[PDB]
Design a protein around this motif. Sequence first.
Motif, mmCIF file in Angstrom:
data_model
loop_
_atom_site.group_PDB
_atom_site.id
_atom_site.type_symbol
_atom_site.label_atom_id
_atom_site.label_comp_id
_atom_site.label_asym_id
_atom_site.label_seq_id
_atom_site.Cartn_x
_atom_site.Cartn_y
_atom_site.Cartn_z
ATOM 1 N N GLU A 1 -26.076 -21.597 -0.353
ATOM 2 C CA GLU A 1 -25.363 -20.510 -0.998
ATOM 3 C C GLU A 1 -23.930 -20.885 -1.392
ATOM 4 O O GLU A 1 -23.215 -21.512 -0.614
ATOM 5 N N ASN B 1 -27.580 -13.869 -5.238
ATOM 6 C CA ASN B 1 -27.494 -13.004 -4.065
ATOM 7 C C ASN B 1 -26.761 -11.714 -4.415
ATOM 8 O O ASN B 1 -25.608 -11.732 -4.853
ATOM 9 N N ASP C 1 -24.962 -21.332 4.012
ATOM 10 C CA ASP C 1 -23.988 -20.673 3.155
ATOM 11 C C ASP C 1 -22.749 -21.551 3.234
ATOM 12 O O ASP C 1 -22.123 -21.643 4.290
ATOM 13 N N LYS D 1 -30.039 -18.435 9.229
ATOM 14 C CA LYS D 1 -28.944 -18.698 8.303
ATOM 15 C C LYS D 1 -27.714 -19.166 9.070
ATOM 16 O O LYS D 1 -27.375 -18.608 10.113
ATOM 17 N N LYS E 1 -25.194 -7.969 -3.395
ATOM 18 C CA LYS E 1 -24.579 -7.247 -2.284
ATOM 19 C C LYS E 1 -24.060 -5.926 -2.848
ATOM 20 O O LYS E 1 -23.255 -5.907 -3.785
ATOM 21 N N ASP F 1 -23.428 -16.415 -4.842
ATOM 22 C CA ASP F 1 -23.098 -15.239 -4.049
ATOM 23 C C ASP F 1 -21.811 -14.705 -4.658
ATOM 24 O O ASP F 1 -21.844 -13.873 -5.559
ATOM 25 N N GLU F 2 -20.677 -15.217 -4.192
ATOM 26 C CA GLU F 2 -19.392 -14.762 -4.694
ATOM 27 C C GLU F 2 -19.239 -14.894 -6.212
ATOM 28 O O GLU F 2 -18.421 -14.189 -6.806
#
Lengths: 353, 354, 346, 353, 344
Positions: free
Chosen positions: C207, C254, C181, C151, C256, C232-233
């Motif tokens: 990402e 994703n 990402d 990554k 977290k 993601d965010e």
Amino acid sequence: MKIKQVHVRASKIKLKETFTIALGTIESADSAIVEIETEEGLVGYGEGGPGIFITGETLAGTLETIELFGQAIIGLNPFNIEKIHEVMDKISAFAPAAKAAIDIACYDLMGQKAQLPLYQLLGGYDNQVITDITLGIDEPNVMAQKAVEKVKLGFDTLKIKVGTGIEADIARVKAIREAVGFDIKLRLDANQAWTPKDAVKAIQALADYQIELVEQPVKRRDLEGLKYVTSQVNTTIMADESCFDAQDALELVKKGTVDVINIKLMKCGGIHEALKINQICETAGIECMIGCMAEETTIGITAAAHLAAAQKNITRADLDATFGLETAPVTGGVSLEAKPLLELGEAAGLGIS
Amino acid sequence: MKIKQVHVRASKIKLKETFTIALGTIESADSAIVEIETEEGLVGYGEGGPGIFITGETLAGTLETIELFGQAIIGLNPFNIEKIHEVMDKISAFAPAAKAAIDIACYDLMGQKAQLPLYQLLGGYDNQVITDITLGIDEPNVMAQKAVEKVKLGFDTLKIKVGTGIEADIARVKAIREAVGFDIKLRLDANQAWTPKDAVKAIQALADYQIELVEQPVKRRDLEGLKYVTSQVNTTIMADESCFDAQDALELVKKGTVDVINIKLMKCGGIHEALKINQICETAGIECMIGCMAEETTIGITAAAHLAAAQKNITRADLDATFGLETAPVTGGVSLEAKPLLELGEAAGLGISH
Amino acid sequence: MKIKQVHVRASKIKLKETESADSAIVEIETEEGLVGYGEGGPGIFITGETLAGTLETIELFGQAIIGLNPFNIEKIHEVMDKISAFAPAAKAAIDIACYDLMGQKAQLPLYQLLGGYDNQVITDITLGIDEPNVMAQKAVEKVKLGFDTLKIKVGTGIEADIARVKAIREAVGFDIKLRLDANQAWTPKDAVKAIQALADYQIELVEQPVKRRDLEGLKYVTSQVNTTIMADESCFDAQDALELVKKGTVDVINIKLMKCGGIHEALKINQICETAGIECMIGCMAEETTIGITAAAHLAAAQKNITRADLDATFGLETAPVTGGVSLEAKPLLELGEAAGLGISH
Amino acid sequence: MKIKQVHVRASKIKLKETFTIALGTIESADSAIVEIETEEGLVGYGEGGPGIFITGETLAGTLETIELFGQAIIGLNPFNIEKIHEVMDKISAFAPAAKAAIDIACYDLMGQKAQLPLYQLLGGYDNQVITDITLGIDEPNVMAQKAVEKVKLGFDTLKIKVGTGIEADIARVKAIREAVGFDIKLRLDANQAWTPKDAVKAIQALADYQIELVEQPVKRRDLEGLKYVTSQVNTTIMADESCFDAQDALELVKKGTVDVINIKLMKCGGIHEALKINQICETAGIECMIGCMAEETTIGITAAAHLAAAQKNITRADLDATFGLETAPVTGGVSLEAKPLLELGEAAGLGIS
Amino acid sequence: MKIKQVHVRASKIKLKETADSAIVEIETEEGLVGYGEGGPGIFITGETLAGTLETIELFGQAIIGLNPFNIEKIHEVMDKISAFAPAAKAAIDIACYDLMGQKAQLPLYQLLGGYDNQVITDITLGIDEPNVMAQKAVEKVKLGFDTLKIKVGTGIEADIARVKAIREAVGFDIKLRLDANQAWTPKDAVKAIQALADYQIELVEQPVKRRDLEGLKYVTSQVNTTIMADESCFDAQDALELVKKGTVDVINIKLMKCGGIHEALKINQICETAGIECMIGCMAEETTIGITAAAHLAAAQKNITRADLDATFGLETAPVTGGVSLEAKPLLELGEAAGLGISH
Ligand SMILES: [Mg+2]
Ligand SMILES: [Mg+2]
Ligand SMILES: [Mg+2]
Ligand SMILES: [Mg+2]
Ligand SMILES: [Mg+2]
């Protein structure tokens, strides 16, 4: 601070060369120049430069409206920009040029009273702006020629006017790119000349010519069509005629109609409204470009420059109106010199005398 | 003008009346107070009012973030509010209390340098603003007595929390209305207490007592439900928790979710963002109210008052925090005196000092 | 069982490459003596949470849950949500410790209580940004360690991005999967342009190519490129997940723990995605350590729909803040073992 | 037939009494009167009566625009109404008053050349129109007494202006109804005074007073809100300010925004465009009402009357501008007499002069 | 833990007023045994006992050797075997969760969320003469029931009559929930609910045909009365579609519709995320095992705020020991026994 009197006069400055766009030609910059005097002696300058092809406004109507506004704001504080616009909006349902004239003069006064350059009061992000230069519609050969001339003047971004015919418009762009190379940014303005379907075709045809963005490819009121073009090409699409004021911007951002919006003080009625447009856009992740009418001069351009320098989201500038003027109506402010860098200085307000 | 240093301190002011929250209570207004000093000697005041139960903001986290922001903005011009917010946003993805603290002090500095009261730099529509006053939750009879007392002081608008059970809510509103008459406006804050259909039922029941508006009747994230309520009752519905920043405001007006939107500097990160919210709303034909946190004081209230007075579309104000403070943390600005009319005066900036 | 006490301490672990991982470590002890471990890894630039705020919030949560049963994860989250309107790191710290306690009381490794699909998970490893040559050299090193997926961060400039990808791809071949990402770096149309250019080097997925709040822009990118797009965010909690799957914004989501406030919320996100036919990956914060990674690994191994893992934080630490759990050794396969709960102690 | 010359002059006619609407007051009808002379001698009359509160147009701007149009249409055939509008649209992006002035004069010439009343050329459905009379905003009891006065004059339909406040506006209507009885038709005009939600509440409040229709209850730009009102009340909702030209009508009919549309020659730029609006509406099952600006006089009203009489789908008329005029600028056409029946006659064209 | 063998048998329990289900016992190598049940309702899912038994047998053999805790793989296996068989899948699923509780030595509700250790259920009133069931109403209320469920949609005149009698009989202190069983067109539903609303109605269940989601959404948007989906929601995918469209206010979960606790958890979390509460119900063919499993799930999850678990009340005997008893009472207390707390 209190408004004592409002002075308005006509200004007719011939352009060094006729400006040709899809909508027609511009031969002179005729604007209403306003001076708002306060009781303490401070005077603010404003300008209303109407483009009949864009808003239908004329110098005569702009003058009459400004007079109506003038006699309605006597006694008001120039800082009460909220009430000033309220009063003007109750008087006229539509007159952005006249409203911008009063508005700009009030901001000039605010800067003078605060003893600060206008860009500091409007956001302070920068104290200068880099502008492109527009090339009027002409034969591909001639356009490319002038493009080289402009690049030699220091311009790294050229705005190309098109809109006579898809086949001819593409040829114009090809010649310019070939003549200047790929180190120069090229943005196009079709001025509502194409149908959404033809717009997509034309834009894709230039897929290899590195076009930064395409301004108003379809009719201003065809929002569905404009959104279609924006959704069909990866090229950045900008609204100009489709966005006059904050309400128009809100509609455009809500519908995801375009990628960028061109702000013009003469379309929105002043800095007060322009700030609204920019903030609405910024919130939606849409950048803005500051533009101008060929009919405005030093005053309108200087006001626009201060706003553009002050705001982070106004990332592009197309303020080349003074470059075509035969003379300047006032001292100070943005020069008549054809140059890409517009430095504002530290003089209070607009920095115009 | 350039920032030389940013000083931050904790501020703890005892409350005249304890504030009851979910699973706890608040007896003191504990906030962060910032002082931005410029190279020339001018100093601006700001405040970061936490509210863990509303924004998640804590005093400890706010103090830490303000310190980070402070060292990052040294050397910048307070007028470059565009870059100042850019810098804070790069540092923290979310910290409205800390961002407001820096933001407010910068605007105070702008007023001081320009030698103008802040409201003159924010729109200049007016130099004063009328605020309501919140009545602490208590037995109906006690709240009624308090209502008459506040009306005697000149208040024409009272605010009370509901969503504590319809019978209890009705009992309190009934007593209050009977005590002061129908010329007094009553604002209710349902604090995300009801499900959409329960909200419609409760609001229509409370409406029999003449209600000016009902604030956030459903959970902040339930925009569909909030819109449902707004569309099913005649009572004005106002978004509070559903609107933190400009992006939330845009979503709300786009969907036509509510009738009014309540701005709070400690929710949006300062005056800079608050202006965006108001402009978005005004453009959509939606008026705005501005409120305050249970844990903010003089500085926060004064900044909000200058903004409310300056902007035409901020037509309502719920800025009563100073009225419940045992003592003033600073000099100047909106006073501790309980009065509906907040007159701003001609002092530059916030008109606040040590 | 009943919670007897809650302790929390600030933890600072030096990173092998730039400076350290700062997090809050929690220990929840029951009346009968069991101790569960949790971690809250702030990320000021991602969630806005600070260590000071996280510590203060955890203390408040701790006081409020004394006497409660760790298995009442429903009430535990209810109490935390009543106390704080937003504090995913603090909520995750408490949540993880409660799940650890559940496993210990049930005398089962945590993954068995979370779905039991597998007892191990394969993770990629992130290469630190550097000169294309240096990155390519490290890529070879990582592949030598057994890593089949690398990554790297992009969005630092198309030319720089391409140079790095080109160097790496050329040095390790095409058998190695590369996920990028973009860290919200591009506007929607710029993203399509950049991604299609990077796509020539065989990219597994990209990402968060645009700002987290630009869901329309994110959907545009997803619909315009062949490359798999992952949110993601744009996805913090279950409500965000529901909105993303509802609008068909992305290809993958994703998860977290430090974004969603713990395993309890992460399970919701995964079930929502799985129902919509969207796979999930689970990642980590630059500020978390052993505990957070271990908790995430158990969840990833337990759930079938969590098909990818980017749990490499422990590989970048100079030392471990606790004993047990996922080790500091850089290896692609994270084997959980049979220890009850997280298998961690201090 | 060919246009030889275009004459334009200003007209300032004081109103018998100030007219008050939600947007503001009107004290005089100031319009631009146009005379288009052909080579053969026939002369056509037209008028441009701008309402600054509606379109932002002014007399001075309208005069300058008409002059521009005038010098551009010399040599054209008045029957070539297609090219005449093409030419005007190329000259100005927005000037309905100016466009209507030229347009009306051309239709007057068509009638004169054909030796037929204008209504025969525009559809010939009828040769007369029945109009309502508008009552300006005032105190309830005062408005009521004025209503009784108007009914005694023969008016069976009264247009009530409201827009100062829901509670006050409701009171005005109640007083008028009770004073005139239910045999009189009452239509309301709120001039964008209410929010969608307040509009619904207000309309439902009069659900017992037999309101024929409610005109423009919300802001001109708030189409979603306007559609909401129309969908929430069984009372007929009409758009006025929300519809200027054919493009606006198309958008409104496409979205089902309203039940009826108010056509004004001074909003759409003349008869040519008004016919488009009516046919678009008729196709969608939406009836139209013909309206006017208080600034218009005999010419504009007579033109509108011929169009309304000619077209089946223009089922309502609000042509009361001449009733408030102190004097008439030309002979013939619709009289200054306050009466509901406007009979057109057999004189060619407009039947003026 | 490993599954050694899966035993399945048909069960027949005599009712009091005019239950056939498949009972499964999953035996682990260690010796622990989990209980499960599949109650097929041919009128709801088309499933037959014969088909359910055959399917469970197929599932049983395919999962031998698997860990009951690997509920993810167990459903994966079943789903690859049959495209549709919620009764059979629920049978295996429930037994696995029972085994999880036994191995972990904890009541099942602790493993499913632990929000509570008991649940309050409503009771269904058999449709009959307005005065009859009205009598039974005051009767059921005396038993402690504060909520009564009533079938409607057999004619607005008849429905309103039965409700009126019941209301004037038991008073407005008792909550009444109605189940229209897909009886009305969207338009007739609005009118019916409109009329019944005057008698204080807690909610109306499935007022329109199962697949008319547009129509169901219409009803929900037109009345302030709470509307609940039953037949319109079988599994998680259905729930997701309903919440995405704001089709209803509440969703009724039934283990025999979704294929077990594993899927039911998905439905509830999807609903909870959208601010939609869930009720847990039951099939007429279910008995002790199914009801107990549902009771533990409802007790454990905060968002499952209502319960309609009265299947055991109409049984004369129980096929197993423990779990929810046959007694007709509003309160269902689960206890501290591991898993379902059920034995031979
Ligand atoms: Mg342009
Ligand atoms: Mg509130
Ligand atoms: Mg990422
Ligand atoms: Mg009207
Ligand atoms: Mg049912």
